[PDB]
Amino acid sequence: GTGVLTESNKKFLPFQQFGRDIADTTDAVRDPQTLEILDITPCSFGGVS
Amino acid sequence: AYTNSFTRGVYYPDKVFRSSVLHSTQDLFLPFFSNVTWFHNPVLPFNDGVYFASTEKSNIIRGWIFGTTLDSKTQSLLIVNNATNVVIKVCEFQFCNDPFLGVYSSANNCTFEYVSQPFLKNLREFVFKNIDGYFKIYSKHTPPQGFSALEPLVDLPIGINITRFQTLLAAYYVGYLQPRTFLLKYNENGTITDAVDCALDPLSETKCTLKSFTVEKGIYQTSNFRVQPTESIVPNITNLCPFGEVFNATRFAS
Amino acid sequence: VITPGTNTSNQVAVLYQGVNCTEVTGSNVFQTRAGCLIGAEHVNNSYECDIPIGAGICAVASQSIIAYTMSLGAENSVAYSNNSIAIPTNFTISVTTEILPVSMTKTSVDCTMYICGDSTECSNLLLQYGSFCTQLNRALTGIAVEQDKNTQEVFAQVKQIYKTPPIKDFGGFNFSQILPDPSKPSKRSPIEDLLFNKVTLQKFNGLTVLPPLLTDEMIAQYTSALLAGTITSGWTFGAGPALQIPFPMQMAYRFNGIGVTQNVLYENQKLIANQFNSAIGKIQDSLSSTPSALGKLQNVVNQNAQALNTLVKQLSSNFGAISSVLNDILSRLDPPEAEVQIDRLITGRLQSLQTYVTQQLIRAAEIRASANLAATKMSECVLGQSKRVDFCGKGYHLMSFPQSAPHGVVFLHVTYVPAQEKNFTTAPAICHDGKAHFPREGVFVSNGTHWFVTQRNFYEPQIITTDNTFVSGNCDVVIGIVNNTVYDP
Amino acid sequence: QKFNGLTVLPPLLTDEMIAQYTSALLAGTITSGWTFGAGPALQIPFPMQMAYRFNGIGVTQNVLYENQKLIANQFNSAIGKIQDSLSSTP
Amino acid sequence: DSTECSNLLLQYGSFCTQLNRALTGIAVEQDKNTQEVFAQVKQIYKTPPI
Amino acid sequence: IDRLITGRLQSLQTYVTQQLIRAAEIRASANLAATKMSECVLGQSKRVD
């Protein structure tokens, strides 16, 4: 994916590898090697008026 | 024997965190309120997945075997719990007539092995599925009414075909998974707290249609009734080709 | 599936739409002409509809689900005869509400980020589809600029921001539930507070939600200006300058415009005030203690949400081609053959985006029709007093108030309802000479013995004099005419 | 009138019930006038109802009574004429 | 009644449940239209017999 | 098959879009008829024609 990773306070269960949203888009991921939970934000966009 | 399998045997299907949501998924599940078989140890089919449950006090059940013929022609799985390590082998074993833990005699052609930290008024539930060469074991141990979701344990890349299985060894329960769609309720902490079987009764069809656990008063279209055809039914045969005077002619030719 | 809601029971009935009841869990089947109803018990006692089935059948009542032919209402024969009228002797003042949606959320969806993400293979293969995406963004931009026009033509009908005077002496009327509350933030009325708390309302792959041009703090300032203008000046500020007038005198104008004389207001000014204050306080409860009163505002929100939720969930569809993920198809296949699967995914996602935009365009027309209706109701009901019946609530319209709600407006229509009538005897005219007398304004009633003139909408009987009648011809041609004295003053 | 995927759902109000609504509205306005649309239906004799409706278009009330039998005759002959405006030209 | 695009059609996503949603919205709106036009009396008035 | 699916589904979408436009037209006409039943039948209307 493409996005901004930030530190997150979402508590995963010890088998769940990545979060998801009610659109079924992945908005969190546990990284391996340290098992931190990382949020995913889309890289900021918008029109130019 | 038979027992009702009330709302029991729901497992986390996909290792995905989901928070405060109602996710509707289609996977092999044990249907709600089915007839689970109660046993007090025969071979049993595996047809497409097996739910297993056992209540005990003194770890009397110690593992399982899985396979196709269990006769050293094809490889078979052997899951055995010691007191401290659980051992999972995939080898071409020869099985005894009544295997109980000396079953492991003549362990040949061992194509997989694995050892980990062990399993097991304290009901222990397991779900075994065998999809695309992967053997998935889900379990939960809890102190059979009520709801509890089965965390996964292992996902072994064994690649072997399984048709039958058998418990090694005083009572347990064996149920069979079916390709049914559910609606699972994921908590704020990501755990499953409730589920709805979308073909159990019409009310659960509405709950799966609306993607809600509470429906409001009204009339809701859920599905399509459609009568299926039972038979198949197909010009007064009239003009036979004149093979008689070709074959029963009184005089033939040079 | 007929259900009475899972907060009442878990019984359901099942309607099979349009099949005979010979073609199939069986308890008590019932043929309906709408289908086959299984699980509902057919009764003969007709009631009022709550779960509509079809062809006249409706459907829990005393721990079972029934199915009845619905009733249209209570039958009454009103006691008609030649020479009898009923005249009201009292009234109620009824404040009803009307909730109208005004605007939607101004979404805008970029194609190239939606349909192609960041894959330049997808983008370069999308350029050959032409001007579909500038068409789609032009359509959604037209919708979005129309939403702000909807809001400002509903609410911004005051040139000036009026303020109610700091002492609230309106003759006994208590507009405290509709005037803004300064002792709280956001400066909203109690009713506008419960309208915002009872409506319960996301930036991803292509979607962006433009904020509305008028903030809610500004829409509430418009609607407090409209309230202060109506309270302090009446209808005079919708026409020209705001001409102040005391609120009982304004309400006496407004009885005088529904045909009731203005002494009926003053001589009952306390009672009327109390009825107003008790009817304006039940709006608070009838919204608070009744969910799904704001359903007309709610569905709009829900529909827009699920349209977006069907758009985003349409991204995870294969549409044919082997994967719905744009990266797992560039790193799978060779690109003289990858760009037939990419193209298949483009035409699937483009038709999904285009059908979303066509659903948006055709739903924004509904909201524009409703916003035109709300602007008409603000102009005619709030800024004036309508004579057009049931346009501003049931009853003879007195005056009405706006309240801002999220993406909509709530009108509190104060109407005059006649009440506790009694029947009398009437004549078309009264002959006291060889001349026939007709009432100037009003009608000739009889209490059984003597004859009177009342106004038509409120029973106050006067003596029939020559200054509330007029003569026309002899008392020969009027079919049905009584002889009673007409007292010359 | 259904073959393949398409079904025609019957309306919730049958034509008997729509005709019962229509007779309810129409018997309300004959016997009570406009008063049944606001509050309770207050009965009023139909000449005296119609005189109010002349008085609402600026014609005074005596124009009704002094021409009442004329007005009833034009009314009946105009509703008799409106069957023939639909039982004829398509 | 063929299974072969009860499988290919599922690959097209939620198009056949969006169209049904639209048509049932139209159908509920038709009954709302008739109810709004005709059901404007609480009571069923009856004309006198003579 | 997929050619026939993308033909018939597009034909169905065209039907549903035409029906949604025609339903909008009939809802406008039905709102007009409800207004005429209110103002013309249940009262006496001063609005010209």
The DSSP line for C318-372 is -SSSS-S-SHHHHTTS-TTTHHHHHHHHHHHHHHHHHHHHHHHHHHHHHHHHHHH
Local structure of A18: helix, strand or coil: strand
Confirm or reject contact between E37 and chain F (CB < 8 A).
Answer: yes
CA C242, C244, C246: angle at the middle one, nearest 5? 150
Enumerate the residues of chain C whose CB falls inside 8 A of the CB of residue F28.
369
Assess if residue B247 is contained within a domain.
Answer: no
Rounded to whole angstroms, the Cα distance separating F27 from F39 reads 18
Mutant choice from F2, F3, F22, F29 vs E, greatest count of E C-beta within 10 A: F2
Chain B nearest-CA residue for E28: B219
Rounded to whole angstroms, the Cα distance separating E21 from A41 reads 32
Using CB atoms, pick whichever of E13, E18, E43 lies closest to residue C76: E43
Enumerate the residues of chain D whose CB falls inside 8 A of the CB of residue E47.
23, 27, 30-31
Q: Give Cβ neighbours of residue B36 (< 8 Å, ≥ 6 apart).
A: B2, B3, B4, B5, B30, B51, B53, B173, B174, B175
CA C363, C366, C370, C373 torsion-angle sign: positive
Distance from CA of F6 to the nearest CA of C (A): 10
In this structure, the number of other CB atoms found within 10 A of the CB of residue D87 comes to: 7
What would the two tokens of residue C47 be?
Answer: 């009631």
Rounded to whole angstroms, the Cα distance separating C261 from C169 reads 24
Q: Which residues pair with B138 in a beta bridge?
A: B127, B152
Rounded to whole angstroms, the Cα distance separating C296 from C99 reads 7
CA B116, B117, B123: angle at the middle one, nearest 5? 125
Which amino acid is residue A15, in one-letter code?
A: F
Chain F nearest-CA residue for D54: F44
Enumerate the residues of chain E whose CB falls inside 8 A of the CB of residue B226.
1
Q: What is the DSSP letter of C427?
A: E
E strand or H helix that includes residue C122: helix C120-126
What would the two tokens of residue C144 be?
Answer: 């979005």
Assess if residue B44 is contained within a domain.
Answer: yes
Q: Give Cβ neighbours of residue C188 (< 8 Å, ≥ 6 apart).
A: C180, C181, C196, C220, C404
What is the number of helices (H) and of strands (E) in chain E?
Answer: 1, 1
E strand or H helix that includes residue C259: none
Strands B2-4, B10-11: pairing kind: unpaired
The dihedral over CA atoms of C330, C334, C337, C339, expressed in degrees to the nearest 10, equals: 30
Cβ-contact B54, B64 below 8 angstroms: no
Say yes or no for a CB contact (<8 Å) between D37 and F43: yes
How far CA B111 is from CA of B106, B157, B251, C341, in Å, comes to 14, 11, 77, 39
What would the two tokens of residue B216 be?
Answer: 């409001």
E strand or H helix that includes residue C75: strand C74-76
Distance from CA of F43 to the nearest CA of D (A): 5
Say yes or no for a CB contact (<8 Å) between A42 and C203: yes
Residues, chain E, total? Answer: 50
Rounded to whole angstroms, the Cα distance separating F25 from C79 reads 41
- Phi then psi dihedrals of residue D50, to 5 deg: -65, -35
**Resolution attained, angstroms:** 3.0
Q: Which of B219, E44, F36 has its CA nearest to residue D12?
A: B219
Cβ-contact C278, C268 below 8 angstroms: no
Which amino acid is residue C317, in one-letter code?
A: S
Cβ-contact C404, C215 below 8 angstroms: no
Rounded to whole angstroms, the Cα distance separating C164 from C180 reads 10
What's the distance, Cα to Cα, between the start and end of chain F in Å? Answer: 57
E strand or H helix that includes residue C268: none
B111: containing domain: 2-226
Enumerate the residues of chain E whose CB falls inside 8 A of the CB of residue D41.
43, 45
Q: Give Cβ neighbours of residue C240 (< 8 Å, ≥ 6 apart).
A: none
Cβ-contact C396, C258 below 8 angstroms: yes
Burial class (CB within 10 angstroms; exposed 0-12, middle 13-18, buried 19+) of C128: exposed
Confirm or reject contact between D23 and chain F (CB < 8 A).
Answer: no
CA D64, D68, D70: angle at the middle one, nearest 5? 115
Rounded to whole angstroms, the Cα distance separating C261 from C462 reads 13
Confirm or reject contact between E2 and chain D (CB < 8 A).
Answer: no
Q: Which of F44, C51, C50 has its CA nearest to residue C37?
A: C51
Q: What is the DSSP letter of E12?
A: G
Which amino acid is residue C260, in one-letter code?
A: V
Enumerate the residues of chain D whose CB falls inside 8 A of the CB of residue E48.
31
Cβ-contact C359, C367 below 8 angstroms: no
- Phi then psi dihedrals of residue C453, to 5 deg: -125, 125
Rounded to whole angstroms, the Cα distance separating C256 from C290 reads 35
Using CB atoms, pick whichever of D11, D24, D30 lies closest to residue E31: D11
In this structure, the number of other CB atoms found within 10 A of the CB of residue C98 comes to: 18
How far CA C40 is from CA of C13, C48, C49, C67, in Å, comes to 5, 16, 15, 6
Size of interface C-E (CB pairs under 8 A): 50
Distance from CA of C15 to the nearest CA of B (A): 9
Assess if residue B37 is contained within a domain.
Answer: yes
A23-29, long-range: CB < 8 A, 24+ apart: A23/C204, A23/C309, A23/C312, A23/C313, A24/C313, A24/C316, A25/C204, A25/C205, A25/C312, A26/A1, A28/B17, A29/A5
Cβ-contact D6, C17 below 8 angstroms: no
Strands B16-17, A18-19: pairing kind: parallel
Burial class (CB within 10 angstroms; exposed 0-12, middle 13-18, buried 19+) of E43: middle
Rama region for C78: left / alpha / beta (φ>0; ψ in -120 to 50; rest): beta
Chains in contact with B, where contact requires at least 3 CB pairs less than 8 Å apart = A, C, E
Mutant choice from F5, F11, F15, F41 vs D, greatest count of D C-beta within 10 A: F41
The dihedral over CA atoms of D73, D75, D78, D82, expressed in degrees to the nearest 10, equals: -130
Say yes or no for a CB contact (<8 Å) between D24 and E31: no
Half-sphere exposure of C457 (CA within 13 A, CB side): 23
Q: What is the DSSP letter of C51?
A: S
In this structure, the number of other CB atoms found within 10 A of the CB of residue C82 comes to: 12
Say yes or no for a CB contact (<8 Å) between F44 and D37: no
Rounded to whole angstroms, the Cα distance separating C484 from C461 reads 15
What's the distance, Cα to Cα, between the start and end of chain D in Å? Answer: 27
Rounded to whole angstroms, the Cα distance separating D21 from D27 reads 10
Assess if residue B151 is contained within a domain.
Answer: yes
Cβ-contact C317, C310 below 8 angstroms: no
Please name the residue that has the structure tokens 């977006």: C308
- Phi then psi dihedrals of residue C277, to 5 deg: -70, -25
Rounded to whole angstroms, the Cα distance separating B182 from B185 reads 10
B87-90, long-range: CB < 8 A, 24+ apart: B87/B113, B87/B114, B87/B115, B88/B112, B88/B113, B88/B114, B88/B115, B88/B116, B88/B154, B88/B156, B89/B113, B89/B114, B90/B156, B90/B158, B90/B160
Q: Which residues pair with F24 in a beta bridge?
A: none
Flag whether E touches A (3+ CB pairs, 8 A cutoff): no
Half-sphere exposure of C363 (CA within 13 A, CB side): 24
Which amino acid is residue B137, in one-letter code?
A: I
Assess if residue B246 is contained within a domain.
Answer: no
Say yes or no for a CB contact (<8 Å) between E36 and F34: yes
Which amino acid is residue B111, in one-letter code?
A: T
Assess if residue B238 is contained within a domain.
Answer: no
Burial class (CB within 10 angstroms; exposed 0-12, middle 13-18, buried 19+) of C104: buried
Say yes or no for a CB contact (<8 Å) between C391 and F39: yes
Please report the DSSP string for chain B in residue order: -EEE-TT--EE--S-EE--SEEEEEEEEEPPTT-EEEEE----EE-BTBEEEEEEESS----EEEEESS-BSSS-EEEEEE-SS-EEEEEEE-B--SS----TT-S-EEEEEEEEES----EEEEEEEEEETTEEEEEEEEE---S--EEEEEEEE-------EEEEE---EEEEE-EEEEEEEEE-SSS-EEEEEETTSSHHHHHHHHHT-SS--SEE-------PPP--------------HHHHS-SS---
Chains in contact with A, where contact requires at least 3 CB pairs less than 8 Å apart = B, C
Chain D nearest-CA residue for F40: D34
Rama region for C256: left / alpha / beta (φ>0; ψ in -120 to 50; rest): alpha
E strand or H helix that includes residue C41: strand C41-42
Confirm or reject contact between C78 and chain E (CB < 8 A).
Answer: yes
Q: How far is CA C469 from the centre of its chain?
A: 43
Strands B149-156, B134-142: pairing kind: antiparallel
Say yes or no for a CB contact (<8 Å) between A20 and B18: yes
Cβ-contact F30, E33 below 8 angstroms: yes
Say yes or no for a CB contact (<8 Å) between F19 and E23: yes
Local structure of C49: helix, strand or coil: coil
- Widest CA span in chain B: 98
Q: Give Cβ neighbours of residue B233 (< 8 Å, ≥ 6 apart).
A: none
C239-246, long-range: CB < 8 A, 24+ apart: C242/C160, C242/C162, C246/C171
Q: Which residues pair with C416 in a beta bridge?
A: C93, C396
The dihedral over CA atoms of A22, A23, A28, A30, expressed in degrees to the nearest 10, equals: 90
Rounded to whole angstroms, the Cα distance separating B114 from B81 reads 12
Distance from CA of E36 to the nearest CA of F (A): 6
Distance from CA of F39 to the nearest CA of C (A): 5
Please name the residue that has the structure tokens 């008392």: C475
How far CA C42 is from CA of B128, C22, C70, in Å, comes to 48, 17, 12
What would the two tokens of residue D7 be?
Answer: 């079904």
Distance from CA of D11 to the nearest CA of E (A): 7
Local structure of F28: helix, strand or coil: helix
CATH code assigned at B47: 2.60.120.960
Distance from CA of E39 to the nearest CA of D (A): 6
Assess if residue B185 is contained within a domain.
Answer: yes
Size of interface D-E (CB pairs under 8 A): 43
Say yes or no for a CB contact (<8 Å) between C205 and A46: no
Chain B residues at the A interface, defined by Cβ less than 8 Å, are 12, 15-19, 21, 151-152, 189-191
Rounded to whole angstroms, the Cα distance separating C301 from C404 reads 16
Rounded to whole angstroms, the Cα distance separating D6 from C18 reads 11
Cβ-contact D20, E44 below 8 angstroms: yes
Say yes or no for a CB contact (<8 Å) between D25 and F41: yes
What would the two tokens of residue D4 be?
Answer: 């393949």
Cβ-contact C365, C354 below 8 angstroms: no
Mutant choice from C306, C317, C344, C389 vs E, greatest count of E C-beta within 10 A: C317
Rg (CA), chain A: 13
Enumerate the residues of chain C whose CB falls inside 8 A of the CB of residue F39.
388-391
Assess if residue B152 is contained within a domain.
Answer: yes
Burial class (CB within 10 angstroms; exposed 0-12, middle 13-18, buried 19+) of C437: buried
E strand or H helix that includes residue C70: none
Confirm or reject contact between E44 and chain D (CB < 8 A).
Answer: yes
Say yes or no for a CB contact (<8 Å) between A23 and C204: yes
Size of interface D-F (CB pairs under 8 A): 15
Confirm or reject contact between F33 and chain E (CB < 8 A).
Answer: yes
Cβ-contact D48, C428 below 8 angstroms: yes
Q: What is the DSSP letter of C468?
A: S
Dump strand ranges (E) for chain D. Answer: none
Rounded to whole angstroms, the Cα distance separating F4 from C134 reads 29
How far CA C266 is from CA of B63, C10, C91, C255, C260, in Å, comes to 93, 56, 14, 10, 12
Rounded to whole angstroms, the Cα distance separating C29 from E18 reads 31
What would the two tokens of residue B120 be?
Answer: 């097991």
Cβ-contact C442, C459 below 8 angstroms: no
Rounded to whole angstroms, the Cα distance separating C267 from C253 reads 14
Burial class (CB within 10 angstroms; exposed 0-12, middle 13-18, buried 19+) of C409: buried
Please name the residue that has the structure tokens 């005990």: B56
Q: Which residues pair with C15 in a beta bridge?
A: C37
Local structure of D20: helix, strand or coil: helix
Confirm or reject contact between E50 and chain D (CB < 8 A).
Answer: no
Cβ-contact C131, C202 below 8 angstroms: no
Confirm or reject contact between D38 and chain C (CB < 8 A).
Answer: yes
C285-289, long-range: CB < 8 A, 24+ apart: C286/C97, C287/C97, C287/C191, C287/C194, C287/C195, C287/C198, C288/C194, C288/C198
Rounded to whole angstroms, the Cα distance separating C17 from C37 reads 9
Cβ-contact B197, B184 below 8 angstroms: no
Chain D nearest-CA residue for F46: D57
Confirm or reject contact between C181 and chain A (CB < 8 A).
Answer: no
Enumerate the residues of chain E whose CB falls inside 8 A of the CB of residue D3.
none
Rounded to whole angstroms, the Cα distance separating C329 from C119 reads 11
Q: Which of B14, C6, C445, E39 has its CA nearest to residue D21?
A: E39
Chain E nearest-CA residue for B229: E1
Chains in contact with F, where contact requires at least 3 CB pairs less than 8 Å apart = C, D, E
Q: What is the DSSP letter of A44?
A: P
| Tally of structural domains, chain B | 1
Cβ-contact C122, C326 below 8 angstroms: yes
Enumerate the residues of chain D whose CB falls inside 8 A of the CB of residue F11.
none
